[PDB]
Amino acid sequence: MSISISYSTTYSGWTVADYLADWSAYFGDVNHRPGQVVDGSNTGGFNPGPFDGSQYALKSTASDAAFIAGGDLHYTLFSNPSHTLWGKLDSIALGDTLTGGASSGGYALDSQEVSFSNLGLDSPIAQGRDGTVHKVVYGLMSGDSSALQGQIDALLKAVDPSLSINSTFDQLAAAGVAHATPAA
Numbered sequence: 001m002s003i004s005i006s007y008s009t010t011y012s013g014w015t016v017a018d019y020l021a022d023w024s025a026y027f028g029d030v031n032h033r034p035g036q037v038v039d040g041s042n043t044g045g046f047n048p049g050p051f052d053g054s055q056y057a058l059k060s061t062a063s064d065a066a067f068i069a070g071g072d073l074h075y076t077l078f079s080n081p082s083h084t085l086w087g088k089l090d091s092i093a094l095g096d097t098l099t100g101g102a103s104s105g106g107y108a109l110d111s112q113e114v115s116f117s118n119l120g121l122d123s124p125i126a127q128g129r130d131g132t133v134h135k136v137v138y139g140l141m142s143g144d145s146s147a148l149q150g151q152i153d154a155l156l157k158a159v160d161p162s163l164s165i166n167s168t169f170d171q172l173a174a175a176g177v178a179h180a181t182p183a184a
Contacts, residue, residue, distance in 0.1 A: 003155040005178035006115045007169040012180065016152060016172070017165040019114060020145040023094055028062035029143040034083075044141075048102040051075045056085070057107040058141060059098045066098035067140050068107050070117075073133070074125070081128030089121040089133045092140070092148065112181075114169075116152060 011019055030042040037043060044058030052074045059066040070091035076084040097110035123131030129138075135147040149165050156163040156177070163175055172178035 001118060002159050003119065003152070003177060004117045005169065005172055006112070006117075007173075007178055007180060008113050009180050009184040011114060012170045013168055015166050015168055016156075017149055019169075020149055020152075020165075023065070023113070024140070024143050024145040026063060027060045027065035027067070027140065027143065030058065030061050030141050032138075032141050045101055045107075046073065046075070047106050051077055052087075053102075055107050056137065057098055057101075064096045066095065066109060068093040068098070068109060069137050069140075071119075071121075071133075076125065081125070084125065084128045084131065085134045085137050086123045086125050086127070086131050087133060089119055089123075089136060091115060091117040091119060092136075094140075116148075119151060119155065121151065 032042050042061055044056055046053030047055040054070065054072060056069040056073050057066065069089055070093070071088040073085060073089065074087045076082060093109055093112055093115040095109040095112040098107060099110055100107045121133050121136065123133035132147070132151065136151060139145055139147040153165045156165065156167065159177055160175060163172065163177065169178055173180060
């Protein structure tokens with residue numbers, strides 16, 4: 001099957017591009033780069049970890065914004081190619097108030113706004129930071145969601161050429177690809 005989207009009823013009339021652009025600016029840049037990752041405040045975490053998991057989650061240091069990347073993910077840490085997030089990315093959940101972690105059986109968002117599933121991304125280790133999984137996730141860490149937008153757009157086009165990141169969430173629901181959250 002194809003991409004599947006969950007959205008809060010608040011974003012019915014928003015386009016995906018507009019929402020992601022606003023979400024990016026809200027989450028901001030955690031400043032996760034060489035020389036600026038000195039403690040656990042801007043690293044995020046893996047479930048189960050320490051370097052691999054079915055989830056990678058990160059909260060904003062600017063706000064209550066958080067995301068959860070779901071799939072089969074791996075971080076190289078110091079091994080070559082250095083500082084590469086790779087593997088399978090099935091889903092990205094975006095919202096507020098990250099809860100849980102490895103010690104309590106998984107991460108969750110207290111207030112999920114939007115999630116994208118069946119992304120079908122799969123980047124090998126040998127691509128390093130040129131990998132699509134890497135760029136998508138690092139984009140979300142550093143306040144630029146355009147890599148994610150690009151992948152969502154391709155997945156939507158594949159379902160129908162009239163669907164895009166510029167479609168509204170309601171339009172995407174009308175197309176059978178999205179669904180509004182039962183409790184907003």
